[PDB]
Amino acid sequence: GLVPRGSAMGFDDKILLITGGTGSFGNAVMKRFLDSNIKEIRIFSRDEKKQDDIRKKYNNSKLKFYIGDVRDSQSVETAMRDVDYVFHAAALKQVPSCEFFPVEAVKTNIIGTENVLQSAIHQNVKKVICLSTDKAAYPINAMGISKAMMEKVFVAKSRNIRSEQTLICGTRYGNVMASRGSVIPLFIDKIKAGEPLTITDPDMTRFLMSLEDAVELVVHAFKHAETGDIMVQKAPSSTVGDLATALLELFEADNAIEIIGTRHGEKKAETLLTREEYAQCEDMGDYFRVPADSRDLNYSNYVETGNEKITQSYEYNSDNTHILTVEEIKEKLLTLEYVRNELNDY
Amino acid sequence: GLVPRGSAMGFDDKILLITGGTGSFGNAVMKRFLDSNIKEIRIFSRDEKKQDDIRKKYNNSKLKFYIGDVRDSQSVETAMRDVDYVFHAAALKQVPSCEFFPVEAVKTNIIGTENVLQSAIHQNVKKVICLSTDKAAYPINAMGISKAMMEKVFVAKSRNIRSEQTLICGTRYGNVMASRGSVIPLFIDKIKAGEPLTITDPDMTRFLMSLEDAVELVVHAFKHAETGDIMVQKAPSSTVGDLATALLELFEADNAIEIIGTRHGEKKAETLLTREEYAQCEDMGDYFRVPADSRDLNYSNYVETGNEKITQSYEYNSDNTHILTVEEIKEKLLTLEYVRNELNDYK
Amino acid sequence: GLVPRGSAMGFDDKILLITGGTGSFGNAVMKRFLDSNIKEIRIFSRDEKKQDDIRKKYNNSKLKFYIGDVRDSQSVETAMRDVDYVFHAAALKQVPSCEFFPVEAVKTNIIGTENVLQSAIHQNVKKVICLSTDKAAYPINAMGISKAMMEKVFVAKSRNIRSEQTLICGTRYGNVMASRGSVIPLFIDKIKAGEPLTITDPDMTRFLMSLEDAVELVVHAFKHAETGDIMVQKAPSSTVGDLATALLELFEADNAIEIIGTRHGEKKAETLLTREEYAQCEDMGDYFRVPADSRDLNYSNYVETGNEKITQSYEYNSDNTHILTVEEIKEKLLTLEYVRNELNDYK
Amino acid sequence: GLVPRGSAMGFDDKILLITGGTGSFGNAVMKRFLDSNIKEIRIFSRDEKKQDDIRKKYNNSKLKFYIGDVRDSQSVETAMRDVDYVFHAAALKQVPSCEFFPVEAVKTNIIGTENVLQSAIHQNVKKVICLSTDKAAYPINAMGISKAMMEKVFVAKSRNIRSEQTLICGTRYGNVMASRGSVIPLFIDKIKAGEPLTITDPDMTRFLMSLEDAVELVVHAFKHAETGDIMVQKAPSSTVGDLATALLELFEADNAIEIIGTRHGEKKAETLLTREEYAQCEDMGDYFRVPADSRDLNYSNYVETGNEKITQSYEYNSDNTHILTVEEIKEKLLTLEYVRNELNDY
Amino acid sequence: GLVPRGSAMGFDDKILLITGGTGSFGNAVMKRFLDSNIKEIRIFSRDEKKQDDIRKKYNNSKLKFYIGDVRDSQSVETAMRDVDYVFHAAALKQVPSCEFFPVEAVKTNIIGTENVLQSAIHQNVKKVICLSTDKAAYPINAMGISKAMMEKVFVAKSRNIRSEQTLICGTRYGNVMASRGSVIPLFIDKIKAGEPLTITDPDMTRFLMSLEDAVELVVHAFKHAETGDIMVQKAPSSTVGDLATALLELFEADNAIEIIGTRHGEKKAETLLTREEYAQCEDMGDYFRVPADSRDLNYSNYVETGNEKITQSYEYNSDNTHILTVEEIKEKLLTLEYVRNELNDY
Ligand SMILES: CC(=O)N[C@H]1[C@@H](OP(=O)(O)OP(=O)(O)OC[C@H]2O[C@@H](n3ccc(=O)[nH]c3=O)[C@H](O)[C@@H]2O)O[C@H](CN=[N+]=N)[C@@H](O)[C@@H]1O
Ligand SMILES: CC(=O)N[C@H]1[C@@H](OP(=O)(O)OP(=O)(O)OC[C@H]2O[C@@H](n3ccc(=O)[nH]c3=O)[C@H](O)[C@@H]2O)O[C@H](CN=[N+]=N)[C@@H](O)[C@@H]1O
Ligand SMILES: CC(=O)N[C@H]1[C@@H](OP(=O)(O)OP(=O)(O)OC[C@H]2O[C@@H](n3ccc(=O)[nH]c3=O)[C@H](O)[C@@H]2O)O[C@H](CN=[N+]=N)[C@@H](O)[C@@H]1O
Ligand SMILES: CC(=O)N[C@H]1[C@@H](OP(=O)(O)OP(=O)(O)OC[C@H]2O[C@@H](n3ccc(=O)[nH]c3=O)[C@H](O)[C@@H]2O)O[C@H](CN=[N+]=N)[C@@H](O)[C@@H]1O
Ligand SMILES: CC(=O)N[C@H]1[C@@H](OP(=O)(O)OP(=O)(O)OC[C@H]2O[C@@H](n3ccc(=O)[nH]c3=O)[C@H](O)[C@@H]2O)O[C@H](CN=[N+]=N)[C@@H](O)[C@@H]1O
Ligand code: NA
Ligand code: NA
């Protein structure tokens, strides 16, 4: 549900703004809230085409289409007036595009976020949920470094704005299974083309999250996050070599593997909580919550006083979570209707 | 050597601009270049008071004092006209203050650097060297993250602007030994006051670099870096417990150790080259050079083509260099005039 | 012909920048210039995903993919360095979305164009061709008004900057046949689904232009426009009722027609040249050239001196060109591969 | 009067801001409100001279002189604090000056307006009345195109701001008779110089409005416009050939006519309501009101659903209004004290 | 005390912001308020070092350290939220640095001040006290001219903002005795080096103010200034030749004097109140208060109506105040612990 258990919450008079609202996450979130009594869902983005396709597709009076840009504070102000909740998903998110145009990454992902937070604070928005990526933890590419910096920026407001004025929090998850351009559809197309599957490093591990998992994470933060939190879903992982086997077997395919080597900007394993975060997080069940530290702007935690619990802690990553067997991966894959439709047609 | 063996530069008609000029780094680089034939060293910062002290202290006709702020392009442009070389050291560099004010860290360390680079390109500057830190590699704190992003910003120029137009490169090094506020003067003060030494985690390792090491790394980049390069100096490391022991012994002191635990914003070990950087780097001897990849803006190294050499590389860090022994740390500590003076003053 | 008969251009050392590069117009111009000796075609937009699809689809070394936004001058300047030719197609071009967000239409279509022009002048670009629409002539909707104002902005340069510095011109054409979201694919879908064809006003006339027509108009301007020129392609028109009949017949289909009435934001007939433009234009054959007036900034053509030729001119519009017959419309519709494929797939 | 009939309106505690307040319309509006109990009339403009001449001329404690620029939002904010009503008349309004410097036209007429609207909304201004021109309908020159765009910008706020917060509307009229530089004083001076009257196109028609007519239009909008309205005064027209005859006869002059031809940037006839506007306007008597459409940002009126009433409608212009005879034009001319003083001295 | 006599004032829930808070005045003001029940003292400046030294030095939970820049309105907004009082001391204040970089002087001293005032007005700050210098009266160098302009800017808000919203006032004093770089420590070091004292012009007069005097002036304005006031402390002066004698005698030193001549950018005498200010000030005892004129923006005081009291008035400067004898100067010097410690060690 969209409401905590035993909660006195009604959406009848509320307005949700989604930035990046035409992207595929913005889109699944929109569908989740359309099934609610929310008054208005504002879809905010520069893409007049995407907006018109959605408008015609859903034909739903809850949906409002705003043209604007997170880089421009006046364009954000216009869509922010009267809004109660913001799911901030606008971002430059491709690794190579950010690597070659990092100033562009900073204007959208960092300054764009700060525009949206300042405007939500000015308009008395109740909640802002910022989206981030496991590429933000111990980051190595311009994309993940811009998102790690975006986290620092949204966290820093909790050392400055009253939760009862505007609650600001964020969610961090890995690439979603079967998202466009990702390795599941790459492999599947290779299978169907009778071409070899190109594996970078078969011993790489990545967390496995469906789109539905990633939408539930955003809804969990929307319901339970306190201001300054970063919220992560616990998730299993697999090696890429095993994901490939799994897809081979499901499609009963005989395609060879071709090892192409690790690409620029990629880790062997992804981290979801650094050592410090893991040391300080609270376990909410299927989620970890990382509370903002030093909300009173006391510096001494950084300088004079330390914690032997940080000294003793480990980081949370795709090598030390539950690494799925080949049969577990097939099972998880069969929960994805994307995989199922492709499996049928084959 | 401000110049490669077998080279001559006239610096005689050249102009060096140092941002961050009044800080202790700009200051040691400044002093290095005063002993050259350089025509003019422009000290650029907003600290009018420190500028006046440096002016009075050195009393040297080569030095010019410019007021201005890397956050303001017109302020930089005023100081950049006719400059040949820029050492870009302006930064917000404390961890806690970047953590709490990260928009200010982006404004000075990222947007400020881009202002300096765009103006240096506009004014036909020959080289810009950007200073960075080992806290930028696999960064955890807002400060190291902002410096990581600055590195991506200065490297991205080498895939747009042409080396014989403006060579743009950077150096990355760890905390300098005996710097203002760092653990060596902390520990020495604790000794002298007869108080216990507050150790966070005795098994932490940190690269050991003197100020003169760091100044040599900048000069090595100035002479030898190509556009897009990140230059690092190979360095030994020590554990924090052995650094305490070494000082305790040099000072013949018996203060207790008190373990206060790991502070927020800090790692067990520092990384100087990530796995991908190590795999791609060139060994210059006592230095590694990380060349910029994909100078022609081709995306296929990121998407379709990979490299097995990245796959079986690992990272260069303060646990896998040479970790000094207690007696090696004392030998290094004794090379520092700060340590000698403290020790002398101690009887 | 990317070059006038009796000319040679080496494009071999030349660089073309397309703003709006990922849209369907930039895409067809791009494909046109891939078959030339052009050194590099830079696709400029903020759509990182569409850029990656184009990159993978074409796999052509001439293509470079730049992230950036016509609203940001430094973003444009990065992509404009060393460019020889700019096709400026970036725009907000839907009517309802410019109507409801007209400040966004001004930011992208007017201020965005001025950013592109100032940077092209700064970087010594040889030509910029700006794309415009017949909704800009006697405009009624925020979209056509913003494009009318963009035309005034690019024409006003020719009364300031010098042709052998940067030639600046534009093309104006109507909706392209079978474009995304346009009435032809609407009607074909309605046929295939066995639903009635929703006609607004059957007596509306619109100029008929294919995508290849439109691409030829841009190439005609690139070869032949002078600075300040607005170029238009002469074109026939049809009424909307005959376009429906033509499709109904090609598809041997019997769907009813439903009249829904004129929508907000639309005219009965489109204008391609106003009265003043017609009076002043040169006939190039299948094209009209509208020269920029008063290149020396003299005001007297506006105040003290008039022209009897403007007085007895009229306007070039979709009612006074050649209005195609049903059978002529079917002949034109059959030249489009989109229509052929739809028709083929239909049995 | 300044107050609707039967209305409970008092100006005792209200503040009016006029931008472009030193221009000749700003000036007649000022004189109209000086005859009221308004507390303060702020005259806002860059022209320190014009302001000091007015200050000395009127010597009236209601008048306050602010220096500022509609292009600068901070300069507008300073004059906007505590204001109840704004008559926004600042503009670049010469045809050739806008044609040659259209970026200048956009910064004053379009962005300048958006600065004034955002600031009036921030300061809780009750009413903003924007002035526009018949050159804005089916516009052909940079000046009228910038004003047509300005209309779209002020209308668009009614799809976003509550009338009870800030009512935003606009008025559209043609050139005013006997305004400086206009054809009535040009002709009259030709008469007095014994030179031929230079007529562009004798068959051109233009609406005839006195300055007093144009001030009554602004007051009518101030009293009755709802948010998003464009308000036009019904007005007769004349051919230029007939205006010239009329002036010739009134002055009993024998001057020849010289035909100089249509100039750049001029239409044969002016439009006051386009076809779409005319189809949707309400007739208030001597005025038409064009209501803002789609205030709920429903797109479908643009895309899926049409109106056969638009299909059937005609536009409202100076050829299809009442075209005055030569005797009617003389009569109207004799109501203008400008014409009378010139007639006497002659 | 920090509270007027008989005043109902409590600092328990109040927040003070100090810009330029790491400079030596910002620092003495901070120490004064630390001795009070104020809830928070925010130290605002770009100098992360200075801030950390203070934090460690005082180790006091009242102190909060903000990084920011008066030149950036968003950086000021962050530190201004929830603030009750601002002591605005950020400035470029060296004569030669402003002379050579006057654009820099204008961005910090003039535009920086206007950022801080606009933000204090937006955040409903109760009081802003701006600091200025006697070099601002009849100014001759870029530094004093930028500060004279800063005074005009803060005064001008009182012709526009209600005191009950935000009271804006300023204090004007000369260089403080024994401040860093000033002539007392220069001379003293000359004495101790056995070098000649370099005197510019022995007949120059300057007002003598201790740091404690200058802090009491700021506290007096904080307690009693009304909006638009400039507040000056009455102060005696000395000739430089006499200051030098005094120091010579106190240290029983035989150093010669060397006359170096007047330097660029220096007056013979400093003015604290111009003629106009002196004519209009109220004498509060040990302070003069200069009230803002024409708070209703009536121009006529400038143009049509004059005051024979201005015609008759004199200016208040270091030649017409009480010029101290050599023995008086020694006495005043001995109240400065700086002088005392130096005297001892010698
Ligand atoms: C374009 C690019 O270089 N990488 C975009 C992409 O992020 P990335 O982490 O590469 O995800 P993927 O699903 O491709 O690889 C997963 C695993 O399979 C491996 N992999 C991948 C491709 C391949 O051919 N073979 C292979 O083994 C690969 O090494 C890894 O171990 O998609 C992201 C998010 N997509 N969404 N939403 C964007 O942020 C990025 O810009
Ligand atoms: C303020 C702060 O949090 N750290 C500033 C500082 O970065 P940092 O890495 O802390 O260097 P240090 O010299 O303090 O620690 C070395 C080792 O001693 C250990 N350490 C440190 C302090 C102590 O009391 N005990 C202790 O064991 C400690 O855990 C570590 O393992 O110095 C940087 C460079 N400039 N200087 N100095 C600034 O960028 C930073 O803001
Ligand atoms: C969204 C919208 O309102 N109109 C977009 C569109 O501009 P437009 O002029 O509508 O072109 P079209 O191809 O729809 O109509 C042709 C004729 O068919 C008639 N028409 C149209 C639709 C219909 O259902 N019935 C009908 O008779 C119609 O009245 C007309 O007489 O296409 C433009 C260019 N890009 N495309 N496609 C975008 O700039 C616009 O935002
Ligand atoms: C400077 C310029 O080119 N035109 C300014 C002007 O707008 P415009 O519409 O020309 O009004 P006018 O009163 O001149 O012509 C009326 C009729 O008489 C005709 N006309 C005019 C001059 C002439 O010599 N002969 C003639 O027949 C003319 O063709 C037309 O049919 O004044 C406007 C508003 N003025 N006010 N307030 C400004 O917006 C413009 O910048
Ligand atoms: C750097 C510079 O040129 N002047 C800074 C300085 O302001 P200023 O008024 O010079 O004060 P000082 O204490 O030096 O002279 C007092 C008298 O002694 C005389 N004087 C001074 C020096 C000397 O060698 N001999 C001498 O006779 C001198 O002529 C004068 O009659 O300190 C100021 C504030 N400092 N604080 N806080 C800054 O605003 C300025 O930038
Ligand atoms: Na922040
Ligand atoms: Na708008």
Short mmCIF file of N, CA, C and O in Angstrom, two decimals, chain A residues 96 99-100 106 138-140 146 149 152 156 159 260-266 268 275-276 280 298-299 301-304 306-307 311, chain B residues 96 99-100 102 138-140 142 145-146 149 152 159 201 260-266 268 275-276 280 298-299 301-303 306-307 311:
data_model
loop_
_atom_site.label_atom_id
_atom_site.label_comp_id
_atom_site.label_asym_id
_atom_site.label_seq_id
_atom_site.Cartn_x
_atom_site.Cartn_y
_atom_site.Cartn_z
N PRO A 96 29.04 6.69 -20.03
CA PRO A 96 29.95 7.39 -20.99
C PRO A 96 29.57 8.87 -21.25
O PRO A 96 30.44 9.78 -21.32
N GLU A 99 30.86 10.78 -18.37
CA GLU A 99 32.32 10.77 -18.36
C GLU A 99 32.89 11.80 -19.31
O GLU A 99 33.90 12.53 -19.01
N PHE A 100 32.30 11.86 -20.49
CA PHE A 100 32.78 12.84 -21.51
C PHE A 100 32.26 14.27 -21.32
O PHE A 100 32.99 15.24 -21.70
N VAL A 106 27.14 17.57 -13.65
CA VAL A 106 27.05 18.37 -12.44
C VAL A 106 25.84 19.30 -12.58
O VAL A 106 25.11 19.47 -11.67
N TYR A 138 31.62 4.53 -3.04
CA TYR A 138 33.02 4.37 -3.50
C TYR A 138 33.08 4.60 -5.07
O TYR A 138 33.57 3.71 -5.80
N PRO A 139 32.55 5.76 -5.53
CA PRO A 139 32.28 5.87 -6.96
C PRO A 139 33.54 5.98 -7.76
O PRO A 139 34.53 6.58 -7.27
N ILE A 140 33.50 5.55 -9.00
CA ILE A 140 34.64 5.63 -9.86
C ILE A 140 34.37 6.36 -11.16
O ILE A 140 35.34 6.83 -11.76
N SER A 146 28.95 12.22 -9.53
CA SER A 146 27.90 13.28 -9.48
C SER A 146 26.72 12.89 -8.57
O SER A 146 26.18 13.76 -7.76
N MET A 149 27.75 13.01 -4.91
CA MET A 149 27.74 14.42 -4.50
C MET A 149 26.27 14.87 -4.31
O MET A 149 25.96 15.63 -3.41
N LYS A 152 25.23 13.88 -0.87
CA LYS A 152 25.79 14.79 0.15
C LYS A 152 24.93 16.09 0.19
O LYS A 152 24.75 16.65 1.24
N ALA A 156 22.80 17.15 3.46
CA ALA A 156 23.20 18.39 4.12
C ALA A 156 21.98 19.27 4.51
O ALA A 156 21.98 19.85 5.57
N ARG A 159 20.79 18.87 8.09
CA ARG A 159 21.44 19.53 9.14
C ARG A 159 20.94 20.99 9.22
O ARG A 159 21.30 21.63 10.19
N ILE A 260 35.04 -10.24 -23.41
CA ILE A 260 35.49 -9.03 -24.02
C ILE A 260 36.36 -8.22 -23.07
O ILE A 260 36.97 -7.28 -23.52
N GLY A 261 36.38 -8.54 -21.76
CA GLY A 261 37.22 -7.82 -20.84
C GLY A 261 36.39 -6.73 -20.14
O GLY A 261 35.30 -6.31 -20.60
N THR A 262 36.88 -6.27 -18.99
CA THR A 262 36.22 -5.21 -18.25
C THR A 262 36.27 -3.88 -19.06
O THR A 262 37.31 -3.52 -19.63
N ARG A 263 35.16 -3.13 -19.07
CA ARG A 263 35.12 -1.89 -19.87
C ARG A 263 35.59 -0.70 -19.02
O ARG A 263 35.78 -0.81 -17.78
N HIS A 264 35.87 0.43 -19.65
CA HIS A 264 36.14 1.60 -18.84
C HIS A 264 34.94 1.95 -17.94
O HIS A 264 33.80 1.74 -18.31
N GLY A 265 35.24 2.52 -16.76
CA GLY A 265 34.23 2.94 -15.80
C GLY A 265 33.40 1.86 -15.05
O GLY A 265 32.34 2.19 -14.57
N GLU A 266 33.86 0.61 -14.94
CA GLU A 266 33.06 -0.49 -14.33
C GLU A 266 33.90 -1.09 -13.21
O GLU A 266 35.10 -1.40 -13.42
N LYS A 268 34.38 -4.46 -10.44
CA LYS A 268 34.15 -5.90 -10.36
C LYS A 268 32.88 -6.19 -9.54
O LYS A 268 32.15 -7.13 -9.83
N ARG A 275 31.46 1.17 4.32
CA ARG A 275 31.73 0.75 5.71
C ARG A 275 31.07 1.67 6.75
O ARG A 275 30.42 1.17 7.72
N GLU A 276 31.23 2.98 6.59
CA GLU A 276 30.67 3.94 7.55
C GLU A 276 29.13 3.87 7.65
O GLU A 276 28.55 3.87 8.76
N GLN A 280 26.50 2.53 10.71
CA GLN A 280 25.57 3.39 11.34
C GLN A 280 24.13 3.14 10.96
O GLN A 280 23.27 3.81 11.48
N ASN A 298 27.45 19.78 14.69
CA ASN A 298 28.66 19.56 15.48
C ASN A 298 29.69 18.80 14.69
O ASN A 298 29.42 17.74 14.08
N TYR A 299 30.85 19.44 14.65
CA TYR A 299 31.99 19.03 13.91
C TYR A 299 32.76 17.92 14.67
O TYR A 299 33.63 17.28 14.08
N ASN A 301 32.46 14.93 15.85
CA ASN A 301 32.42 13.55 15.29
C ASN A 301 33.38 13.28 14.14
O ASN A 301 33.56 12.08 13.75
N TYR A 302 33.91 14.37 13.55
CA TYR A 302 34.78 14.36 12.40
C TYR A 302 36.17 14.56 12.86
O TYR A 302 37.11 14.20 12.16
N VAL A 303 36.32 15.15 14.02
CA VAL A 303 37.64 15.67 14.41
C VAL A 303 38.13 15.07 15.75
O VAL A 303 39.19 14.49 15.78
N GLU A 304 37.39 15.24 16.84
CA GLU A 304 37.89 14.84 18.19
C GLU A 304 37.36 13.47 18.70
O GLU A 304 37.91 12.88 19.62
N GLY A 306 35.59 9.51 17.88
CA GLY A 306 35.55 8.52 16.83
C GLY A 306 34.63 7.46 17.35
O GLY A 306 34.10 7.61 18.45
N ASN A 307 34.52 6.35 16.63
CA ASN A 307 33.62 5.25 17.01
C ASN A 307 34.32 3.97 16.64
O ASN A 307 34.59 3.73 15.45
N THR A 311 35.30 1.32 13.15
CA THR A 311 36.56 0.60 12.98
C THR A 311 36.32 -0.87 12.71
O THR A 311 37.11 -1.48 12.01
N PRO B 96 35.11 18.23 7.31
CA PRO B 96 33.85 18.43 8.00
C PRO B 96 33.12 19.62 7.36
O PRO B 96 31.92 19.61 7.20
N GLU B 99 31.63 18.51 4.22
CA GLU B 99 30.49 17.62 4.52
C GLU B 99 29.18 18.33 4.87
O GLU B 99 28.07 17.96 4.41
N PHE B 100 29.33 19.43 5.56
CA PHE B 100 28.19 20.17 6.06
C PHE B 100 27.74 21.21 5.08
O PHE B 100 26.58 21.63 5.18
N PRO B 102 28.10 21.12 1.32
CA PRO B 102 28.68 20.51 0.11
C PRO B 102 28.41 21.39 -1.11
O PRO B 102 29.15 21.33 -2.10
N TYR B 138 38.01 6.39 -5.04
CA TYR B 138 36.94 5.71 -4.30
C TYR B 138 36.45 6.62 -3.12
O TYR B 138 36.56 6.22 -1.93
N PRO B 139 36.08 7.86 -3.44
CA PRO B 139 35.86 8.85 -2.36
C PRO B 139 34.64 8.52 -1.44
O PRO B 139 33.62 7.95 -1.89
N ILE B 140 34.78 8.86 -0.17
CA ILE B 140 33.64 8.75 0.77
C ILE B 140 33.08 10.05 1.30
O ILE B 140 31.93 10.06 1.73
N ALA B 142 32.41 14.48 1.15
CA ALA B 142 31.95 15.42 0.20
C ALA B 142 33.22 16.08 -0.37
O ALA B 142 33.25 16.45 -1.55
N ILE B 145 34.83 13.63 -2.76
CA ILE B 145 33.91 13.51 -3.96
C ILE B 145 34.00 14.75 -4.89
O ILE B 145 34.09 14.62 -6.12
N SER B 146 33.91 15.95 -4.31
CA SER B 146 34.05 17.17 -5.10
C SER B 146 35.42 17.13 -5.85
O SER B 146 35.52 17.57 -7.02
N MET B 149 35.25 14.79 -8.72
CA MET B 149 34.49 15.35 -9.85
C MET B 149 35.38 16.40 -10.56
O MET B 149 35.37 16.49 -11.83
N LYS B 152 37.45 14.63 -13.03
CA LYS B 152 36.72 14.29 -14.25
C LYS B 152 36.59 15.56 -15.14
O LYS B 152 36.65 15.46 -16.36
N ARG B 159 39.66 15.64 -23.99
CA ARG B 159 38.96 15.06 -25.06
C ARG B 159 38.32 16.18 -25.97
O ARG B 159 37.91 15.78 -27.05
N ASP B 201 42.41 4.71 14.89
CA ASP B 201 42.55 3.29 14.60
C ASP B 201 44.03 3.03 14.33
O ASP B 201 44.58 3.53 13.32
N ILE B 260 40.46 6.43 20.33
CA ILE B 260 39.18 7.15 20.30
C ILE B 260 38.24 6.55 19.25
O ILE B 260 37.07 6.95 19.18
N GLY B 261 38.72 5.64 18.40
CA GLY B 261 37.86 5.05 17.33
C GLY B 261 37.90 5.79 15.98
O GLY B 261 38.43 6.97 15.84
N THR B 262 37.44 5.12 14.92
CA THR B 262 37.37 5.81 13.61
C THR B 262 36.36 7.01 13.64
O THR B 262 35.24 6.83 14.11
N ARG B 263 36.77 8.20 13.17
CA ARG B 263 35.91 9.40 13.05
C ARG B 263 35.02 9.25 11.78
O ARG B 263 35.27 8.41 10.94
N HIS B 264 33.95 10.02 11.68
CA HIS B 264 33.16 10.09 10.45
C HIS B 264 34.03 10.56 9.33
O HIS B 264 34.96 11.40 9.54
N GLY B 265 33.73 10.09 8.10
CA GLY B 265 34.40 10.73 6.94
C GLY B 265 35.82 10.15 6.74
O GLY B 265 36.58 10.63 5.96
N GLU B 266 36.15 9.05 7.37
CA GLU B 266 37.51 8.54 7.10
C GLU B 266 37.60 7.05 6.89
O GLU B 266 36.81 6.27 7.45
N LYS B 268 39.99 3.40 6.51
CA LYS B 268 41.08 2.65 7.05
C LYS B 268 42.44 2.84 6.31
O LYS B 268 43.48 2.93 6.94
N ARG B 275 41.73 0.61 -9.42
CA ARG B 275 42.09 -0.49 -10.29
C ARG B 275 42.23 -0.08 -11.78
O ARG B 275 43.24 -0.47 -12.45
N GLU B 276 41.25 0.67 -12.31
CA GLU B 276 41.29 1.02 -13.69
C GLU B 276 42.55 1.92 -13.99
O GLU B 276 43.20 1.80 -15.04
N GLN B 280 46.03 1.13 -16.36
CA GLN B 280 46.27 1.94 -17.55
C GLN B 280 47.47 2.84 -17.45
O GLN B 280 47.88 3.44 -18.44
N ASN B 298 35.31 8.62 -28.43
CA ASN B 298 34.62 7.44 -28.83
C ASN B 298 34.10 6.71 -27.62
O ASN B 298 34.79 6.58 -26.62
N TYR B 299 32.84 6.27 -27.70
CA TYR B 299 32.16 5.67 -26.56
C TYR B 299 32.45 4.14 -26.50
O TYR B 299 32.12 3.51 -25.54
N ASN B 301 34.86 2.06 -25.83
CA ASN B 301 35.62 1.56 -24.65
C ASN B 301 34.79 1.43 -23.39
O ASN B 301 35.23 0.82 -22.41
N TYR B 302 33.66 2.15 -23.37
CA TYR B 302 32.72 2.09 -22.29
C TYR B 302 31.58 1.08 -22.50
O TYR B 302 30.93 0.69 -21.54
N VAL B 303 31.31 0.71 -23.75
CA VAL B 303 30.09 -0.05 -24.08
C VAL B 303 30.42 -1.39 -24.72
O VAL B 303 30.13 -2.40 -24.11
N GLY B 306 36.14 -4.17 -24.13
CA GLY B 306 36.64 -4.13 -22.79
C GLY B 306 38.09 -4.51 -22.81
O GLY B 306 38.66 -4.64 -23.89
N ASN B 307 38.69 -4.66 -21.63
CA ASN B 307 40.10 -4.90 -21.59
C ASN B 307 40.40 -5.87 -20.46
O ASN B 307 40.05 -5.60 -19.29
N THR B 311 40.68 -6.17 -15.84
CA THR B 311 40.11 -7.27 -15.07
C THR B 311 41.08 -7.87 -14.02
O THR B 311 40.71 -8.10 -12.87
#
